[PDB]
Nucleic acid binder design. Structure first.
Ligand SMILES: [Mg+2]
Ligand SMILES: [Mg+2]
Ligand SMILES: [Mg+2]
Ligand SMILES: [Mg+2]
Ligand SMILES: [Mg+2]
Ligand SMILES: [Mg+2]
Ligand SMILES: [Mg+2]
Ligand SMILES: [Mg+2]
Ligand SMILES: [Mg+2]
Ligand SMILES: [Mg+2]
Ligand SMILES: [Mg+2]
Ligand SMILES: [Zn+2]
Lengths: 87, 205, 99, 45, 211, 123, 156, 100
RNA sequence: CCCGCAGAAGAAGCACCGGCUAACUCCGUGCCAGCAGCCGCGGUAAUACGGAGGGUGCAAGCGUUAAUCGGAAUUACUGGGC
RNA sequence: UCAUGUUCACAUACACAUACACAAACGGCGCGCG
């Protein structure tokens, strides 16, 4: 995004919810044998976004044709994994 | 009227996991899932087009436990209902009562859900339904009766349903052993891999 | 030691540092005052974005150099977007603004 | 699963493997340069 | 039509012999027998070392094996142990003191016998013969051979009728006696019989005629 | 063709005849083998296939083929016949039903027993 | 990006002094999936080289078809050597309910709703050329209103 | 990130959020199970004293640690000063096409 | 129709596997015996005959034959040609 | 001028090489160089 000034302020609770894509619930990150992110933990692919480059976690979709579908095996959105750092 | 053979066999034949076992134990540990069934399994002869249509049909039918006559009847009902034939077919199949039971988790596998619905543990709006293929309509309060509400397997399946990711169009309270059907599932609310068009054109050959 | 291109760090996409890793030299704080003390603005813009941090611009730059076009598209560094989120991860709403 | 050391490395031909012995370790007295495989480890799956 | 063995017809002109010694009619046959036995046992031992070419040379007091292969590491191991053991075994076979010298070939893709062993191994592990041949041709050409021509023959892919398939990439002139044509042949012993493999590799027309 | 000509003499679809007239649109008919014999096929095949000149109930006399490996029939025998041509016995447009009045059961058939009228062995 | 699929791989022959020289011909169709399609017909001694030559020829000489939202603009008939084709626009959700090669071409062109039929011969080559003809000679409201000199709302 | 074999790098913040979320899970429990004032004042103190860690560890009475008294780096320790973004990665940064 | 009774206890076949057509290997046999909806298979290594194992498809049925329509723009009014 | 030739009988969609794309990271503690 192009810009030409910067502003800072306190974030009201509804603004903070607005930045959210999900609400974290479990005190966990990734499994300790396999290494999938444990869902609703601090890495859950459906809160933040998919781990694999442009393909989903539940395995159901693996091609740009499905770009932006949300599955119903685990609930992840298939999208750019780049956005996993954005949300 | 039912498939009584090995289940992981079907899973291997399809290739995918069809969820025919509870998923306590990994399928790789129970079998060589990466291999077609039988002596001559290890081979992928370039599948014919109708062949892949057939394979998709078999995948869905053996995920849900529906014999082909009933499945063709479902196909015809979908052709009747207006809208998109594929989403309509998925709507009917999901609306199957044994499927709703498995969904609300009162059964480790859809086989167990059919078993309990057959042995009269399932009641829709206080009326005990004995046919597994009953068509649950929207906003139906489907409950479990007491006699099999003591069932240890029932409670363990409640826990394993809490393990699974929960469907969005079903409101099931485990303590009260009571689910409620609210809205017909969306295509996006079902698994995504299944392609409507394959089954559609297969039966509209 | 010398580096054309290679690794980048994960948290922010700036290059790794080392010989034991194929690293890029730090154009550290004092060097930036040194450029600012010449008039040199475009050199600096490059040095701390296109050559460094802008995840788009560096791949567009590379291709423009192999094409020999000698032109850059400078964008905005992703380490600065890291900062915004690390502030916005406090209850401090910092945001970019338009006019 | 468990790793192996081998010459049977996938995706590489004798052009590189010529300096390994048959076990999967370089010969003593091999003279080596960047990118030579010294030890042909492999991982399952 | 039936072809002339290229290395054979080029002997003396371009290529050098494998064996090199002089011995009169009393010694000759026994020399040849010992050499045949040592080559037999040597190949059988170093089936995996990628042994391109042996060279026997007995200067009337000993035998000198000079073995061009691509895996000195594999044939030697730690500090020539396999080397010296093979040497003593060769000495017992031949009946004279022995000596081994190992030469390392740089491009395993350009030696005919090496390519032959590779294609034969692929076929024994039941890969698609067409794909094997194509990949071999690509490897040789990309390495930079001025020409290469490969041919597999017999029961290709388990068919009942045998036939000969072959590829040529680039130029491989045979009638030019001053062209360095490497040639070799091999046999893949599959469950349907032997599948033959021939490989010509034209490396350049060397005009002086060294050795 | 002009609409006018079609008016004067309409189009009367081609009539596809019966491929099995002696059955008279009836799935099977009874017969009484007048003569059981063997005939050689037509090129390129070679065999000695078993056929019976058979007298239908309605009076037609056809040549029926005797399927399966081995038969125990003879003349004066009551058989049941169904449709379908052999092909390599040109002029034979009927099969005999196996496991019928006199057309006995085959021996030691373990596949297609329903095709060949053989009992379900000890199972 | 161009979604491409073959249709038919036939083995043709040429008799020469010794015996018969076999050769394969693969007829493939490519298309971007948004409305630009193109077919190619390659021949070589081997199936892979044949298919690859076909696909090169097809990736060149593609055409535009005036598309309306995954269906055609008006019932169109096309004729080539032996095949005759009837392609009718269809409602939403119908599917690509058509023959084999017709399905291939319409699908890579992107059309998801179309009623088709292949009267006369069914030779995949002629049927594909006839399908491409029938897709080309289809004009959209923009085209026809430009051609008569009116608005898109006057012709509708 | 995983390191040398099957071990995750101790990635500090994920230990701080882990503190928070554990405390919050307990506090939702003990609220809905309706604990008495003294118990909830315990967990509510421990939660406020944990979010304290996550924001600016060590402005508390003591910085919290997970090793031989190494204080875990919290968010505000990532922003500020000589190892934090403003000096370490924004104002001057490593660059490609360089050598020494 | 409801309630209670003990017991997995009382309940699975049929066709097909050369291509069209989903799904293969071994053995028996040797243009014989045989199969076959069409093309074809069988003459000493039968993925096509017979048996086995394996698999595929339908399932209280499955297959075979008979019959009509469609496919057949193959009586072409819609919609053929000389 | 110059006839005839027993029967049957002859390789087919590229579903990859130890699906495409994918090359080492973060903090102390030290020593040393400037
Ligand atoms: Mg007739
Ligand atoms: Mg098949
Ligand atoms: Mg049969
Ligand atoms: Mg046999
Ligand atoms: Mg057959
Ligand atoms: Mg058989
Ligand atoms: Mg029934
Ligand atoms: Mg008609
Ligand atoms: Mg006509
Ligand atoms: Mg005569
Ligand atoms: Mg003749
Ligand atoms: Zn998914």
């Amino acid at each position: 995004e192009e810009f030409d000034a910067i502003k800072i302020a306190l974030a009201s609770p509804d603004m903070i919810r607005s930045w959210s894509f999900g609400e974290v619930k479990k005190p966990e990150t990734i499994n300790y044998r396999t290494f999938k992110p444990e869902r609703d933990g601090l890495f859950c692919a459906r809160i933040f976004g998919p781990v694999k480059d442009y393909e989903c976690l539940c395995g159901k979709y693996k091609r740009l044709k499905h770009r932006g579908v949300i599955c119903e095996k685990c609930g992840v959105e298939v999208t750019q994994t780049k956005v996993r750092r954005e949300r | 009227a039912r498939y009584l053979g090995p289940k992981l066999k079907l899973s291997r034949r399809e290739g995918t996991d069809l969820f025919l076992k509870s998923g306590v134990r990994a399928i790789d540990t129970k079998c060589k899932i990466e291999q077609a069934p039988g002596q001559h399994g290890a081979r992928k002869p370039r599948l014919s087009d109708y062949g892949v249509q057939l394979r998709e049909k078999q995948k869905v039918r053996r995920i849900y436990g529906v014999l082909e006559r009933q499945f063709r009847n479902y196909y015809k009902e979908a052709a009747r209902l207006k809208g998109n034939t594929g989403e309509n077919l998925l709507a009917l199949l999901e609306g199957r009562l044994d499927n709703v039971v498995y969904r609300m988790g009162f059964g480790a596998t859809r086989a167990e859900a059919r078993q309990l619905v057959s042995h009269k543990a399932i009641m829709v709006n206080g009326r005990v339904v004995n046919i597994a293929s009953y068509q649950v309509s929207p906003n139906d309060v489907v409950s479990i009766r007491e006699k099999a509400k003591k069932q240890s397997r029932v409670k363990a399946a409640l826990e394993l349903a809490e393990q699974r990711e929960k469907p969005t169009w079903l409101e099931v309270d485990a303590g009260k052993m009571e689910g409620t059907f609210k809205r017909k599932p969306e295509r996006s609310d079902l698994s995504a891999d299944i392609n409507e068009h394959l089954i559609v054109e297969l039966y509209s050959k | 030691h010398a580096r054309s291109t290679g690794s980048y760090s994960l948290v922010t996409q700036q290059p790794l540092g080392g010989k034991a890793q194929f690293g890029g030299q730090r154009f550290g704080e004092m060097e930036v005052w040194a450029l600012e003390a010449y008039g040199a603005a475009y050199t600096l813009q490059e040095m701390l974005t296109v050559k460094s941090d802008d995840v788009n611009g560096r791949t567009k730059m590379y291709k423009n150099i192999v094409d020999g076009n000698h032109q850059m598209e400078p964008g905005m560094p992703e380490s600065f977007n890291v900062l915004l989120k690390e502030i916005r991860s406090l209850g401090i709403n910092i945001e970019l603004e338009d006019e | 699963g468990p790793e192996e050391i081998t010459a049977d490395i996938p995706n590489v031909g004798e052009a590189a493997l010529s300096k390994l012995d048959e076990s999967g370790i370089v010969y003593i007295g091999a003279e080596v340069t960047g990118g030579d495989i010294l030890v042909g480890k492999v991982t399952p799956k | 039509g039936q072809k002339v063995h290229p290395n054979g017809i080029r002997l003396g002109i371009v290529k050098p012999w494998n064996s090199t010694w002089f011995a009169n009619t009393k010694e000759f046959a026994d020399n040849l027998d010992s050499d045949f036995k040592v080559r037999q046992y040597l190949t059988k031992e170093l089936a995996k070392a990628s042994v391109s070419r042996i060279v026997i040379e007995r200067p009337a007091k000993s035998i000198r094996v000079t073995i061009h292969t691509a895996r000195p590491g594999i044939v030697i191991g730690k500090k020539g142990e396999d080397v010296e053991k093979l040497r003593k075994v060769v000495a017992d076979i031949a009946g004279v003191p022995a000596q081994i010298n190992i030469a390392e070939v740089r491009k395993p893709e350009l030696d005919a016998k090496l390519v032959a062993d590779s294609i034969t191994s692929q076929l024994e592990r039941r890969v698609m013969f067409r794909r094997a041949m194509k990949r071999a041709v690509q490897n040789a050409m990309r390495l930079g051979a001025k020409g290469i021509k490969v041919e597999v023959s017999g029961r290709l892919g388990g068919a009942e009728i045998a036939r000969t398939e072959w590829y040529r990439e680039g130029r491989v002139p045979l009638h030019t006696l001053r062209a360095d044509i490497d040639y070799n042949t091999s046999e893949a012993h599959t469950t349907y019989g032997v599948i033959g493999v021939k490989v010509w590799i034209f490396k350049g027309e060397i005009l002086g005629g060294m050795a | 063709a002009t609409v006018n000509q079609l008016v004067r003499k309409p189009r009367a679809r081609k009539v596809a005849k019966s491929n099995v007239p002696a059955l008279e649109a009836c799935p099977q008919k009874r017969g009484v083998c007048t003569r059981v014999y063997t005939t050689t096929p037509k090129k390129p095949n070679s065999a000695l296939r078993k056929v019976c000149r058979v007298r239908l109930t309605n009076g037609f006399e056809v040549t029926s083929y005797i399927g399966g490996e081995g038969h125990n029939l003879q003349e004066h025998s009551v058989i049941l016949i169904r449709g379908g041509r052999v092909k390599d016995l040109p002029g034979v447009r009927y099969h005999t039903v196996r496991g019928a009045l006199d057309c006995s059961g085959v021996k030691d058939r373990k596949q297609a027993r329903s095709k060949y009228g053989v009992k379900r062995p000890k199972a | 990006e161009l979604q491409e699929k073959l249709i038919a791989v036939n083995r043709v022959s040429k008799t020469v002094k010794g015996g018969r020289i076999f050769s394969f011909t693969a007829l493939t169709v490519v298309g971007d999936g948004n409305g630009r399609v193109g077919f190619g017909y390659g021949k070589a001694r081997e199936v892979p080289a044949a298919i690859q030559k076909a696909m090169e020829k097809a990736r060149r000489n593609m055409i535009n078809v005036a598309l309306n939202n995954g269906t055609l603009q008006h019932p169109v008939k096309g004729v080539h050597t032996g095949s005759r084709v009837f392609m009718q626009p269809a409602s939403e959700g119908t599917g690509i309910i058509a023959g084999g090669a017709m399905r291939a071409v319409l699908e890579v062109a992107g059309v998801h709703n179309v009623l088709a039929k292949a009267y006369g011969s069914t030779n995949p080559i002629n049927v594909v050329r006839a399908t491409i003809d029938g897709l080309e000679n289809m004009n959209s409201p923009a085209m026809v209103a430009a051609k008569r000199g009116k608005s898109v709302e006057e012709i509708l | 990130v995983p390191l040398d074999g099957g071990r995750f790098a101790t990635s500090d913040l994920n230990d701080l959020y882990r503190r928070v979320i554990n405390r919050n899970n307990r506090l939702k429990r003990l609220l809905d199970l309706a604990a008495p004032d003294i118990i909830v004042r315990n967990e509510k103190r421990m939660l406020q004293e944990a979010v304290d860690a996550l924001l600016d560890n060590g402005r508390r009475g003591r910085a919290i640690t997970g090793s031989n008294k190494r204080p875990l780096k919290s968010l505000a320790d990532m922003i500020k000063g000589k190892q934090g973004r403003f000096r370490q990665n924004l104002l001057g940064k490593r660059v490609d096409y360089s050598g020494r």
